[PDB]
Amino acid sequence: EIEKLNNLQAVFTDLSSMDLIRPRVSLVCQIVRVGHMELKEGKKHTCGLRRPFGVAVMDITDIIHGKVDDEEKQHFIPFQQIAMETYIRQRQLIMSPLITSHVIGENEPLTSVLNKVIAAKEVNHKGQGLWVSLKLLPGDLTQVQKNFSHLVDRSTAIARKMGFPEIILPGDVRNDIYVTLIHGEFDKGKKKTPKNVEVTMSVHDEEGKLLEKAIHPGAGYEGISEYKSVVYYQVKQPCWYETVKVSIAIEEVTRCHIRFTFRHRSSQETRDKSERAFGVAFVKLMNPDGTTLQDGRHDLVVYKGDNKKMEDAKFYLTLPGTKMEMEEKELQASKNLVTFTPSKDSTKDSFQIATLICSTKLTQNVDLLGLLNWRSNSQNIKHNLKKLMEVDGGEIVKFLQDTLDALFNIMMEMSDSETYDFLVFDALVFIISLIGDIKFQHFNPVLETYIYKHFSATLAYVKLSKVLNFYVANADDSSKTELLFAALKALKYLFRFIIQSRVLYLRFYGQSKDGDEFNNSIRQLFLAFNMLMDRPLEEAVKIKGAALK
Amino acid sequence: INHVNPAMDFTQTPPGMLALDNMLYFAKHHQDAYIRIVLENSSREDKHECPFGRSSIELTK
Protein backbone atom coordinates (compact mmCIF):
# COMPACT_ATOMS: atom_id res chain seq x y z
CA GLU A 1 0.00 0.00 0.00
CA ILE A 2 2.01 2.95 -1.34
CA GLU A 3 -0.34 5.23 0.59
CA LYS A 4 2.08 4.87 3.51
CA LEU A 5 5.09 5.17 1.19
CA ASN A 6 5.78 8.80 2.11
CA ASN A 7 3.31 10.23 4.65
CA LEU A 8 4.06 7.93 7.61
CA GLN A 9 3.45 10.17 10.59
CA ALA A 10 2.89 7.99 13.65
CA VAL A 11 2.24 8.67 17.34
CA PHE A 12 2.12 5.91 19.96
CA THR A 13 0.48 7.61 22.91
CA ASP A 14 0.22 6.93 26.68
CA LEU A 15 3.93 7.51 27.31
CA SER A 16 5.20 9.61 30.23
CA SER A 17 8.36 10.30 32.19
CA MET A 18 7.26 7.48 34.47
CA ASP A 19 7.82 5.35 31.37
CA LEU A 20 11.06 7.28 30.79
CA ILE A 21 12.66 6.31 34.12
CA ARG A 22 12.80 2.71 32.95
CA PRO A 23 16.57 2.27 33.22
CA ARG A 24 17.10 1.51 29.52
CA VAL A 25 14.51 2.40 26.89
CA SER A 26 14.09 0.68 23.54
CA LEU A 27 11.72 -0.08 20.68
CA VAL A 28 11.25 -3.63 19.36
CA CYS A 29 10.34 -4.20 15.71
CA GLN A 30 9.61 -7.71 14.43
CA ILE A 31 8.56 -8.13 10.80
CA VAL A 32 6.93 -11.26 9.37
CA ARG A 33 6.45 -12.38 5.77
CA VAL A 34 2.97 -13.05 4.36
CA GLY A 35 2.37 -15.23 1.33
CA HIS A 36 3.96 -18.61 0.76
CA MET A 37 4.77 -20.63 3.86
CA GLU A 38 8.45 -20.78 2.88
CA LEU A 39 10.49 -18.83 0.33
CA LYS A 40 11.35 -21.85 -1.82
CA GLU A 41 9.72 -24.13 -4.37
CA GLY A 42 9.19 -27.84 -5.02
CA LYS A 43 5.54 -27.80 -3.98
CA LYS A 44 2.65 -25.35 -3.65
CA HIS A 45 2.13 -23.83 -0.20
CA THR A 46 -0.88 -21.85 1.00
CA CYS A 47 -1.14 -18.28 -0.21
CA GLY A 48 -0.80 -15.84 2.65
CA LEU A 49 0.73 -17.72 5.57
CA ARG A 50 3.31 -16.48 7.96
CA ARG A 51 6.71 -17.36 9.40
CA PRO A 52 8.53 -14.60 11.32
CA PHE A 53 11.71 -13.22 9.79
CA GLY A 54 13.62 -11.13 12.31
CA VAL A 55 13.70 -8.18 14.67
CA ALA A 56 14.96 -4.64 14.08
CA VAL A 57 16.09 -3.02 17.33
CA MET A 58 17.32 0.38 18.45
CA ASP A 59 17.30 1.73 21.99
CA ILE A 60 15.61 5.08 22.61
CA THR A 61 16.73 5.94 26.15
CA ASP A 62 17.90 9.51 25.55
CA ILE A 63 16.39 9.56 22.05
CA ILE A 64 13.03 10.17 23.72
CA HIS A 65 14.78 12.58 26.09
CA GLY A 66 14.84 14.99 23.14
CA LYS A 67 18.28 16.49 23.68
CA VAL A 68 18.93 16.32 19.91
CA ASP A 69 16.07 17.60 17.74
CA ASP A 70 16.65 16.32 14.19
CA GLU A 71 13.72 16.08 11.78
CA GLU A 72 15.36 14.33 8.82
CA LYS A 73 17.86 12.06 10.55
CA GLN A 74 17.01 8.51 9.46
CA HIS A 75 18.73 6.52 12.18
CA PHE A 76 19.40 3.03 10.85
CA ILE A 77 17.79 0.15 12.72
CA PRO A 78 20.02 -2.93 12.26
CA PHE A 79 17.44 -5.49 11.20
CA GLN A 80 18.47 -8.65 12.98
CA GLN A 81 16.84 -11.53 11.13
CA ILE A 82 16.66 -15.29 11.44
CA ALA A 83 19.84 -16.76 9.97
CA MET A 84 18.62 -18.41 6.76
CA GLU A 85 22.29 -18.92 6.05
CA THR A 86 23.42 -22.43 5.05
CA TYR A 87 25.72 -21.57 2.13
CA ILE A 88 29.18 -21.47 3.76
CA ARG A 89 28.52 -22.54 7.37
CA GLN A 90 28.54 -26.27 6.58
CA ARG A 91 30.00 -27.03 3.15
CA GLN A 92 33.60 -27.41 4.38
CA LEU A 93 33.90 -29.12 7.77
CA ILE A 94 36.72 -31.57 7.11
CA MET A 95 38.54 -34.42 8.96
CA SER A 96 35.63 -35.67 11.12
CA PRO A 97 32.53 -36.65 9.10
CA LEU A 98 29.53 -37.55 11.29
CA ILE A 99 26.86 -34.89 10.75
CA THR A 100 23.05 -35.14 11.03
CA SER A 101 21.32 -31.97 12.24
CA HIS A 102 18.32 -29.72 11.54
CA VAL A 103 17.52 -26.03 11.01
CA ILE A 104 16.09 -23.57 13.55
CA GLY A 105 14.31 -20.92 11.52
CA GLU A 106 11.02 -20.82 13.40
CA ASN A 107 12.14 -23.20 16.17
CA GLU A 108 13.62 -20.23 18.00
CA PRO A 109 12.66 -19.03 21.51
CA LEU A 110 11.61 -15.39 21.58
CA THR A 111 12.95 -14.38 25.01
CA SER A 112 16.36 -15.53 23.82
CA VAL A 113 15.97 -13.55 20.59
CA LEU A 114 14.85 -10.32 22.23
CA ASN A 115 17.30 -10.30 25.13
CA LYS A 116 20.15 -11.35 22.83
CA VAL A 117 19.56 -8.60 20.28
CA ILE A 118 19.48 -6.20 23.22
CA ALA A 119 22.71 -7.75 24.53
CA ALA A 120 24.23 -8.40 21.09
CA LYS A 121 26.58 -5.45 20.69
CA GLU A 122 26.81 -5.77 16.90
CA VAL A 123 24.44 -7.19 14.28
CA ASN A 124 25.91 -7.53 10.78
CA HIS A 125 22.71 -6.54 9.00
CA LYS A 126 23.96 -7.38 5.47
CA GLY A 127 22.62 -4.01 4.35
CA GLN A 128 19.12 -4.59 5.72
CA GLY A 129 16.94 -2.42 7.95
CA LEU A 130 14.80 0.69 7.57
CA TRP A 131 14.69 4.42 8.22
CA VAL A 132 12.82 6.48 10.81
CA SER A 133 13.29 9.52 13.04
CA LEU A 134 11.45 9.00 16.33
CA LYS A 135 10.04 12.24 17.71
CA LEU A 136 8.41 12.81 21.10
CA LEU A 137 5.64 15.41 21.12
CA PRO A 138 4.24 16.58 24.48
CA GLY A 139 0.48 16.85 24.69
CA ASP A 140 -2.29 14.83 23.11
CA LEU A 141 -4.21 14.70 19.83
CA THR A 142 -5.31 18.31 20.38
CA GLN A 143 -1.81 19.79 20.17
CA VAL A 144 -0.44 17.48 17.48
CA GLN A 145 -3.61 17.88 15.40
CA LYS A 146 -3.50 21.66 15.79
CA ASN A 147 0.11 22.69 16.47
CA PHE A 148 2.05 19.96 14.69
CA SER A 149 0.17 19.48 11.42
CA HIS A 150 3.67 19.26 9.92
CA LEU A 151 4.45 16.52 12.47
CA VAL A 152 0.96 15.03 12.93
CA ASP A 153 -1.84 15.17 10.37
CA ARG A 154 -5.31 13.65 10.70
CA SER A 155 -4.22 10.42 8.96
CA THR A 156 -1.35 10.18 11.47
CA ALA A 157 -1.69 6.72 12.96
CA ILE A 158 -2.08 6.10 16.69
CA ALA A 159 -0.96 3.30 19.00
CA ARG A 160 -2.41 3.06 22.50
CA LYS A 161 0.15 1.93 25.06
CA MET A 162 -0.59 -0.54 27.86
CA GLY A 163 -0.96 2.13 30.48
CA PHE A 164 -3.61 3.85 32.50
CA PRO A 165 -2.42 7.48 32.59
CA GLU A 166 -1.09 9.36 35.57
CA ILE A 167 -2.88 12.55 34.56
CA ILE A 168 -6.19 10.70 34.54
CA LEU A 169 -9.10 12.72 33.21
CA PRO A 170 -12.65 11.40 33.60
CA GLY A 171 -14.06 10.31 30.28
CA ASP A 172 -10.62 9.45 28.98
CA VAL A 173 -12.75 7.26 26.74
CA ARG A 174 -11.18 3.81 26.55
CA ASN A 175 -13.29 0.91 25.34
CA ASP A 176 -9.87 -0.53 24.69
CA ILE A 177 -9.57 -4.27 25.38
CA TYR A 178 -6.00 -5.55 25.20
CA VAL A 179 -5.31 -9.29 25.18
CA THR A 180 -1.85 -10.76 24.65
CA LEU A 181 -0.68 -14.16 23.43
CA ILE A 182 2.55 -15.68 24.71
CA HIS A 183 2.99 -19.45 24.63
CA GLY A 184 1.39 -22.87 24.84
CA GLU A 185 2.28 -26.54 25.00
CA PHE A 186 1.99 -28.72 21.89
CA ASP A 187 3.75 -32.09 22.05
CA LYS A 188 5.06 -34.29 19.22
CA GLY A 189 2.87 -37.39 19.36
CA LYS A 190 2.17 -39.55 16.30
CA LYS A 191 3.48 -37.05 13.76
CA LYS A 192 6.50 -36.06 15.83
CA THR A 193 6.25 -32.57 14.36
CA PRO A 194 4.34 -30.52 16.95
CA LYS A 195 1.02 -29.55 15.40
CA ASN A 196 1.14 -26.48 13.15
CA VAL A 197 -1.25 -24.29 15.12
CA GLU A 198 -2.47 -21.14 13.46
CA VAL A 199 -4.45 -19.33 16.13
CA THR A 200 -7.94 -18.67 14.80
CA MET A 201 -9.46 -16.63 17.59
CA SER A 202 -13.12 -15.88 16.94
CA VAL A 203 -15.45 -13.38 18.62
CA HIS A 204 -19.05 -14.57 18.89
CA ASP A 205 -22.33 -13.44 20.32
CA GLU A 206 -23.86 -15.66 23.00
CA GLU A 207 -24.67 -18.26 20.30
CA GLY A 208 -21.42 -18.90 18.44
CA LYS A 209 -22.18 -16.54 15.55
CA LEU A 210 -19.11 -14.63 14.44
CA LEU A 211 -19.41 -10.85 14.52
CA GLU A 212 -17.53 -8.47 12.25
CA LYS A 213 -14.50 -6.18 12.63
CA ALA A 214 -14.16 -6.87 16.36
CA ILE A 215 -10.50 -7.93 16.15
CA HIS A 216 -8.02 -5.09 15.61
CA PRO A 217 -4.56 -6.69 15.55
CA GLY A 218 -3.12 -3.35 14.42
CA ALA A 219 -3.30 -0.06 16.31
CA GLY A 220 -4.12 2.49 13.64
CA TYR A 221 -5.25 -0.36 11.38
CA GLU A 222 -8.84 -1.49 10.97
CA GLY A 223 -10.71 -4.44 12.44
CA ILE A 224 -11.38 -7.96 11.17
CA SER A 225 -14.07 -10.62 11.54
CA GLU A 226 -11.59 -13.51 11.69
CA TYR A 227 -7.91 -13.82 12.63
CA LYS A 228 -5.09 -15.95 11.22
CA SER A 229 -1.84 -16.15 13.19
CA VAL A 230 1.87 -16.40 12.46
CA VAL A 231 3.47 -19.86 12.43
CA TYR A 232 6.43 -21.36 14.27
CA TYR A 233 8.11 -24.43 12.79
CA GLN A 234 6.61 -27.10 15.04
CA VAL A 235 8.03 -25.95 18.37
CA LYS A 236 7.07 -28.40 21.10
CA GLN A 237 6.53 -25.48 23.51
CA PRO A 238 5.93 -22.61 21.09
CA CYS A 239 6.12 -19.00 22.24
CA TRP A 240 4.42 -16.12 20.41
CA TYR A 241 4.61 -12.91 22.48
CA GLU A 242 1.68 -12.21 20.17
CA THR A 243 -0.58 -9.20 20.72
CA VAL A 244 -3.96 -8.27 19.25
CA LYS A 245 -6.53 -5.71 20.31
CA VAL A 246 -10.33 -5.85 20.31
CA SER A 247 -13.10 -3.33 20.97
CA ILE A 248 -16.73 -4.30 21.59
CA ALA A 249 -19.91 -2.50 22.58
CA ILE A 250 -19.87 -2.46 26.36
CA GLU A 251 -23.27 -4.17 26.50
CA GLU A 252 -22.94 -6.78 23.75
CA VAL A 253 -19.55 -7.85 25.12
CA THR A 254 -21.46 -8.80 28.27
CA ARG A 255 -23.32 -11.39 26.16
CA CYS A 256 -20.38 -12.47 23.99
CA HIS A 257 -18.23 -15.57 24.14
CA ILE A 258 -15.07 -15.69 22.04
CA ARG A 259 -14.06 -19.06 20.60
CA PHE A 260 -10.49 -20.03 19.72
CA THR A 261 -9.95 -22.68 17.04
CA PHE A 262 -6.52 -24.18 16.33
CA ARG A 263 -6.27 -25.52 12.78
CA HIS A 264 -3.56 -27.91 11.60
CA ARG A 265 -1.56 -26.66 8.61
CA SER A 266 0.17 -29.16 6.37
CA SER A 267 2.95 -27.96 4.07
CA GLN A 268 0.78 -27.96 0.94
CA GLU A 269 -1.96 -25.42 0.22
CA THR A 270 -4.82 -27.80 -0.55
CA ARG A 271 -4.46 -30.09 2.46
CA ASP A 272 -3.95 -26.95 4.55
CA LYS A 273 -7.32 -25.72 3.26
CA SER A 274 -9.13 -29.05 3.72
CA GLU A 275 -7.93 -29.68 7.28
CA ARG A 276 -10.03 -28.04 9.99
CA ALA A 277 -9.50 -27.06 13.63
CA PHE A 278 -8.14 -30.10 15.45
CA GLY A 279 -8.60 -28.23 18.73
CA VAL A 280 -11.14 -25.60 19.77
CA ALA A 281 -10.82 -23.36 22.83
CA PHE A 282 -12.56 -20.16 23.93
CA VAL A 283 -13.33 -17.85 26.83
CA LYS A 284 -16.31 -15.89 28.09
CA LEU A 285 -16.19 -12.13 28.59
CA MET A 286 -17.74 -11.89 32.05
CA ASN A 287 -18.22 -13.65 35.36
CA PRO A 288 -21.53 -15.08 36.64
CA ASP A 289 -21.21 -12.51 39.41
CA GLY A 290 -21.26 -9.87 36.67
CA THR A 291 -17.56 -9.05 36.91
CA THR A 292 -15.19 -9.63 34.01
CA LEU A 293 -12.44 -12.23 33.98
CA GLN A 294 -9.57 -11.05 36.17
CA ASP A 295 -6.39 -9.83 34.48
CA GLY A 296 -2.96 -11.46 34.52
CA ARG A 297 -1.25 -14.51 33.10
CA HIS A 298 -4.05 -16.99 32.39
CA ASP A 299 -2.92 -20.36 31.14
CA LEU A 300 -5.60 -21.56 28.75
CA VAL A 301 -7.52 -24.79 28.29
CA VAL A 302 -7.90 -26.49 24.91
CA TYR A 303 -9.06 -29.93 23.85
CA LYS A 304 -9.01 -32.26 20.85
CA GLY A 305 -11.35 -35.08 19.91
CA ASP A 306 -14.93 -33.90 19.57
CA ASN A 307 -15.80 -31.37 16.89
CA LYS A 308 -19.55 -31.08 17.43
CA LYS A 309 -19.32 -30.37 21.17
CA MET A 310 -16.67 -27.80 20.18
CA GLU A 311 -19.10 -25.98 17.87
CA ASP A 312 -22.58 -26.51 19.38
CA ALA A 313 -22.83 -22.86 20.30
CA LYS A 314 -25.48 -23.12 23.00
CA PHE A 315 -23.54 -25.90 24.72
CA TYR A 316 -19.89 -24.93 24.81
CA LEU A 317 -20.88 -21.82 26.63
CA THR A 318 -20.66 -24.42 29.43
CA LEU A 319 -17.09 -25.61 28.72
CA PRO A 320 -13.73 -24.67 30.28
CA GLY A 321 -11.19 -22.51 28.49
CA THR A 322 -8.85 -21.14 31.17
CA LYS A 323 -7.26 -22.24 34.44
CA MET A 324 -9.13 -20.42 37.24
CA GLU A 325 -12.35 -21.59 35.64
CA MET A 326 -11.21 -25.15 34.92
CA GLU A 327 -10.28 -25.70 38.55
CA GLU A 328 -13.49 -24.08 39.77
CA LYS A 329 -15.31 -26.52 37.47
CA GLU A 330 -13.34 -29.44 38.90
CA LEU A 331 -13.73 -28.25 42.50
CA GLN A 332 -17.49 -27.96 42.15
CA ALA A 333 -17.01 -31.39 40.58
CA SER A 334 -14.68 -32.36 43.44
CA LYS A 335 -17.58 -31.71 45.82
CA ASN A 336 -20.32 -33.17 43.58
CA LEU A 337 -19.93 -35.80 40.85
CA VAL A 338 -23.15 -34.68 39.11
CA THR A 339 -23.66 -32.43 36.04
CA PHE A 340 -19.89 -31.84 35.70
CA THR A 341 -17.09 -34.36 35.13
CA PRO A 342 -13.70 -33.64 33.53
CA SER A 343 -13.84 -35.35 30.16
CA LYS A 344 -11.56 -37.51 28.01
CA ASP A 345 -11.30 -35.04 25.12
CA SER A 346 -8.19 -33.42 26.62
CA THR A 347 -4.96 -33.41 24.62
CA LYS A 348 -1.49 -32.66 25.98
CA ASP A 349 -1.56 -29.24 24.30
CA SER A 350 -1.95 -25.88 26.04
CA PHE A 351 -1.85 -22.11 25.67
CA GLN A 352 -1.73 -19.03 27.87
CA ILE A 353 -2.83 -15.42 27.61
CA ALA A 354 -1.73 -12.68 29.98
CA THR A 355 -4.74 -10.37 29.88
CA LEU A 356 -4.56 -6.70 30.84
CA ILE A 357 -7.56 -4.68 29.67
CA CYS A 358 -7.48 -0.89 29.96
CA SER A 359 -11.17 -0.04 29.69
CA THR A 360 -13.49 2.06 31.84
CA LYS A 361 -16.50 -0.26 31.98
CA LEU A 362 -15.24 -3.76 32.80
CA THR A 363 -14.93 -4.52 36.50
CA GLN A 364 -12.40 -7.07 37.72
CA ASN A 365 -13.21 -6.43 41.38
CA VAL A 366 -15.20 -9.19 43.06
CA ASP A 367 -15.64 -7.08 46.20
CA LEU A 368 -16.93 -4.15 44.13
CA LEU A 369 -19.69 -6.14 42.45
CA GLY A 370 -20.50 -7.67 45.79
CA LEU A 371 -21.03 -4.08 46.92
CA LEU A 372 -23.13 -3.02 43.97
CA ASN A 373 -25.84 -5.70 44.14
CA TRP A 374 -25.62 -5.72 47.92
CA ARG A 375 -29.38 -6.26 48.33
CA SER A 376 -28.74 -9.79 47.11
CA ASN A 377 -25.63 -10.38 49.23
CA SER A 378 -25.57 -7.78 52.02
CA GLN A 379 -24.11 -10.46 54.28
CA ASN A 380 -20.50 -10.05 53.12
CA ILE A 381 -20.71 -6.30 53.79
CA LYS A 382 -18.58 -7.13 56.80
CA HIS A 383 -15.85 -8.51 54.55
CA ASN A 384 -16.75 -6.17 51.71
CA LEU A 385 -15.99 -3.18 53.92
CA LYS A 386 -12.98 -4.93 55.44
CA LYS A 387 -11.47 -5.35 51.97
CA LEU A 388 -12.53 -2.04 50.40
CA MET A 389 -9.46 -0.18 51.64
CA GLU A 390 -7.43 -2.81 49.79
CA VAL A 391 -8.87 -1.91 46.37
CA ASP A 392 -6.87 -0.33 43.56
CA GLY A 393 -7.73 3.30 42.98
CA GLY A 394 -8.36 2.91 39.27
CA GLU A 395 -11.23 0.46 39.60
CA ILE A 396 -12.73 2.75 42.22
CA VAL A 397 -12.50 5.97 40.23
CA LYS A 398 -13.94 4.12 37.24
CA PHE A 399 -17.38 3.93 38.88
CA LEU A 400 -16.83 6.12 41.91
CA GLN A 401 -20.16 7.95 41.81
CA ASP A 402 -22.22 4.78 41.46
CA THR A 403 -20.23 3.20 44.28
CA LEU A 404 -20.85 6.32 46.38
CA ASP A 405 -24.58 6.05 45.84
CA ALA A 406 -24.52 2.33 46.60
CA LEU A 407 -22.73 3.07 49.86
CA PHE A 408 -25.35 5.69 50.67
CA ASN A 409 -27.99 3.05 50.06
CA ILE A 410 -26.28 0.79 52.59
CA MET A 411 -26.08 3.57 55.15
CA MET A 412 -29.66 4.77 54.59
CA GLU A 413 -31.61 1.54 54.16
CA MET A 414 -29.56 -0.50 56.62
CA SER A 415 -29.67 1.68 59.73
CA ASP A 416 -29.26 -1.24 62.13
CA SER A 417 -25.53 -1.90 62.48
CA GLU A 418 -24.11 1.50 63.39
CA THR A 419 -20.69 -0.15 63.53
CA TYR A 420 -21.18 -1.28 59.95
CA ASP A 421 -21.83 2.40 59.29
CA PHE A 422 -18.54 3.19 61.02
CA LEU A 423 -16.96 0.91 58.45
CA VAL A 424 -18.92 2.78 55.77
CA PHE A 425 -17.43 6.01 57.09
CA ASP A 426 -13.93 4.57 56.94
CA ALA A 427 -14.45 3.32 53.40
CA LEU A 428 -15.65 6.68 52.13
CA VAL A 429 -12.71 8.28 53.94
CA PHE A 430 -10.44 5.98 51.93
CA ILE A 431 -12.31 6.97 48.78
CA ILE A 432 -11.97 10.68 49.35
CA SER A 433 -8.32 10.35 50.32
CA LEU A 434 -7.76 8.68 46.97
CA ILE A 435 -9.70 11.48 45.28
CA GLY A 436 -7.60 14.23 46.82
CA ASP A 437 -4.41 13.08 45.11
CA ILE A 438 -2.80 14.59 42.04
CA LYS A 439 -3.08 11.10 40.60
CA PHE A 440 -6.86 11.65 40.44
CA GLN A 441 -7.34 15.40 40.82
CA HIS A 442 -9.55 15.55 37.72
CA PHE A 443 -12.55 13.88 39.32
CA ASN A 444 -13.26 16.61 41.86
CA PRO A 445 -15.37 18.37 39.19
CA VAL A 446 -17.21 15.07 38.84
CA LEU A 447 -17.65 14.98 42.61
CA GLU A 448 -19.13 18.47 42.62
CA THR A 449 -21.35 17.39 39.75
CA TYR A 450 -22.63 14.43 41.72
CA ILE A 451 -23.09 16.48 44.88
CA TYR A 452 -24.88 19.51 43.50
CA LYS A 453 -26.81 17.23 41.10
CA HIS A 454 -27.20 13.65 42.36
CA PHE A 455 -26.47 13.90 46.07
CA SER A 456 -29.81 12.39 47.10
CA ALA A 457 -29.11 11.66 50.77
CA THR A 458 -31.11 13.50 53.43
CA LEU A 459 -30.30 11.77 56.75
CA ALA A 460 -26.58 11.60 56.00
CA TYR A 461 -25.50 14.79 57.73
CA VAL A 462 -27.04 13.90 61.10
CA LYS A 463 -25.72 10.36 61.33
CA LEU A 464 -22.31 11.11 59.88
CA SER A 465 -21.76 14.14 62.09
CA LYS A 466 -22.60 11.86 65.00
CA VAL A 467 -20.15 9.25 63.73
CA LEU A 468 -17.30 11.68 63.16
CA ASN A 469 -17.93 13.34 66.51
CA PHE A 470 -17.73 9.97 68.26
CA TYR A 471 -14.53 9.32 66.32
CA VAL A 472 -12.85 12.61 67.13
CA ALA A 473 -13.84 12.80 70.79
CA ASN A 474 -13.07 9.14 71.48
CA ALA A 475 -9.82 8.88 69.52
CA ASP A 476 -7.58 8.21 72.54
CA ASP A 477 -7.07 4.69 71.19
CA SER A 478 -3.94 4.51 69.07
CA SER A 479 -5.56 2.14 66.56
CA LYS A 480 -8.45 4.56 66.22
CA THR A 481 -5.98 7.37 65.48
CA GLU A 482 -4.82 6.82 61.90
CA LEU A 483 -8.44 6.49 60.80
CA LEU A 484 -8.94 9.96 62.23
CA PHE A 485 -5.64 11.14 60.82
CA ALA A 486 -6.90 10.36 57.33
CA ALA A 487 -10.27 11.82 58.31
CA LEU A 488 -8.59 15.08 59.32
CA LYS A 489 -6.83 14.95 55.96
CA ALA A 490 -10.28 14.64 54.35
CA LEU A 491 -12.44 17.12 56.26
CA LYS A 492 -13.56 19.48 53.51
CA TYR A 493 -15.25 17.10 51.10
CA LEU A 494 -17.11 15.06 53.71
CA PHE A 495 -18.25 18.37 55.14
CA ARG A 496 -19.55 19.23 51.68
CA PHE A 497 -21.49 15.96 51.76
CA ILE A 498 -22.88 16.83 55.19
CA ILE A 499 -24.00 20.27 54.04
CA GLN A 500 -25.66 19.02 50.87
CA SER A 501 -27.40 16.39 53.00
CA ARG A 502 -28.75 19.00 55.39
CA VAL A 503 -29.90 21.43 52.72
CA LEU A 504 -31.61 18.63 50.79
CA TYR A 505 -33.35 17.58 53.99
CA LEU A 506 -34.52 21.13 54.63
CA ARG A 507 -35.81 21.64 51.09
CA PHE A 508 -37.57 18.28 51.44
CA TYR A 509 -38.96 19.31 54.83
CA GLY A 510 -39.46 23.08 54.55
CA GLN A 511 -37.98 23.74 57.98
CA SER A 512 -36.06 21.99 60.75
CA LYS A 513 -37.04 19.79 63.66
CA ASP A 514 -33.33 19.11 64.26
CA GLY A 515 -31.59 22.42 63.60
CA ASP A 516 -31.22 22.99 67.33
CA GLU A 517 -29.64 19.59 67.95
CA PHE A 518 -27.71 19.69 64.69
CA ASN A 519 -25.95 22.94 65.49
CA ASN A 520 -25.49 21.44 68.94
CA SER A 521 -23.73 18.48 67.33
CA ILE A 522 -21.47 21.02 65.67
CA ARG A 523 -20.81 22.65 69.03
CA GLN A 524 -19.89 19.39 70.74
CA LEU A 525 -17.86 18.65 67.61
CA PHE A 526 -15.68 21.67 68.26
CA LEU A 527 -15.70 20.69 71.92
CA ALA A 528 -14.26 17.35 70.86
CA PHE A 529 -11.55 19.16 68.92
CA ASN A 530 -10.73 21.24 71.99
CA MET A 531 -10.56 18.21 74.23
CA LEU A 532 -8.34 16.56 71.60
CA MET A 533 -5.89 19.40 71.53
CA ASP A 534 -5.99 19.32 75.32
CA ARG A 535 -5.24 15.63 75.73
CA PRO A 536 -1.59 14.66 76.08
CA LEU A 537 -0.43 15.34 72.54
CA GLU A 538 2.00 12.43 72.97
CA GLU A 539 -0.60 10.35 71.15
CA ALA A 540 -1.45 12.64 68.22
CA VAL A 541 1.21 15.33 67.70
CA LYS A 542 1.04 15.09 63.91
CA ILE A 543 -2.67 14.39 63.95
CA LYS A 544 -3.65 17.51 65.88
CA GLY A 545 -1.25 19.55 63.79
CA ALA A 546 -3.21 18.28 60.81
CA ALA A 547 -6.37 19.10 62.74
CA LEU A 548 -5.46 22.76 62.90
CA LYS A 549 -4.32 22.37 59.29
CA ILE B 1 31.12 10.43 -16.04
CA ASN B 2 33.48 7.64 -17.21
CA HIS B 3 33.46 3.89 -16.54
CA VAL B 4 36.11 2.65 -18.98
CA ASN B 5 39.03 4.58 -17.40
CA PRO B 6 37.67 5.02 -13.88
CA ALA B 7 40.92 6.28 -12.30
CA MET B 8 41.10 9.56 -14.26
CA ASP B 9 39.97 11.60 -11.24
CA PHE B 10 43.09 10.47 -9.31
CA THR B 11 45.55 12.85 -11.00
CA GLN B 12 44.71 16.17 -9.30
CA THR B 13 46.81 16.71 -6.17
CA PRO B 14 45.42 18.36 -4.03
CA PRO B 15 44.96 15.77 -3.07
CA GLY B 16 45.38 12.60 -5.14
CA MET B 17 46.02 9.64 -2.84
CA LEU B 18 45.02 11.02 0.57
CA ALA B 19 41.36 11.00 -0.46
CA LEU B 20 41.80 7.27 -0.93
CA ASP B 21 43.53 7.17 2.46
CA ASN B 22 40.53 9.02 3.91
CA MET B 23 38.03 6.52 2.56
CA LEU B 24 40.34 3.66 3.60
CA TYR B 25 40.44 4.73 7.24
CA PHE B 26 36.68 5.34 7.21
CA ALA B 27 36.15 1.82 5.88
CA LYS B 28 38.30 0.67 8.80
CA HIS B 29 36.46 2.45 11.61
CA HIS B 30 33.10 4.06 10.74
CA GLN B 31 31.72 0.99 8.99
CA ASP B 32 28.14 1.49 10.21
CA ALA B 33 27.63 4.96 8.76
CA TYR B 34 29.96 3.83 5.95
CA ILE B 35 27.62 1.16 4.58
CA ARG B 36 24.76 3.51 5.47
CA ILE B 37 26.22 6.05 3.04
CA VAL B 38 26.72 3.25 0.52
CA LEU B 39 23.06 2.22 0.62
CA GLU B 40 21.58 5.69 1.09
CA ASN B 41 23.08 6.92 -2.15
CA SER B 42 21.27 3.89 -3.64
CA SER B 43 17.82 5.44 -4.23
CA ARG B 44 18.14 8.84 -5.97
CA GLU B 45 19.02 8.43 -9.65
CA ASP B 46 18.06 12.02 -10.48
CA LYS B 47 20.51 14.88 -9.99
CA HIS B 48 20.12 14.71 -6.19
CA GLU B 49 22.54 11.76 -6.21
CA CYS B 50 25.78 12.63 -4.44
CA PRO B 51 29.10 11.43 -5.91
CA PHE B 52 31.16 10.05 -3.04
CA GLY B 53 34.25 9.93 -5.25
CA ARG B 54 33.73 13.43 -6.63
CA SER B 55 32.52 14.80 -3.29
CA SER B 56 35.68 13.34 -1.77
CA ILE B 57 38.06 14.83 -4.33
CA GLU B 58 36.40 18.27 -4.25
CA LEU B 59 36.14 18.44 -0.46
CA THR B 60 39.61 17.13 0.25
CA LYS B 61 41.40 19.49 -2.12
Q: What does this molecule look like?
A:
Chain B: It comes from Homo sapiens (Human). Chain B: It is found in: Cytoplasm; Cell membrane. The structure is cut from a larger assembly and holds chains A (549 residues) and B (61 residues). Chain A is built from 17 helices and 16 strands. Chain A is α+β, with helices and mostly antiparallel strands. Chain A is globular. Chain B has helices at 18-29, 31-40, 52-60. The longest helix of chain B has 12 residues, at 18-29. Chain B is globular, with a radius of gyration of 12 Å. At the A-B interface, loops of A face helix 2 of B.
Output the keywords.
part of a larger assembly; 2 chains; A: alpha+beta; six-stranded antiparallel β-sheet; three-stranded antiparallel β-sheet; B: 61 residues; mainly alpha; globular; Dedicator of cytokinesis protein 5 (chain A); Engulfment and cell motility protein 1 (chain B)
Radius of gyration over C-alpha positions of chain A, nearest whole angstrom: 30 Å
Q: Biggest sheet of chain B, open or closed, and with what strands and sense?
A: none
Number of strands of chain B: 0
Structural class of chain B: mainly alpha
Strand percent estimate of chain A: 15-25%
CA-atom Rg of chain B in angstroms: 12 Å
PDB class: signaling protein
Keywords: elmo, dock, GEF, GTPASE, RHO, RAC, signaling protein
Entry title: Cryo-EM structure of the DOCK5/ELMO1 complex, focused on one protomer
Chain A: Dedicator of cytokinesis protein 5
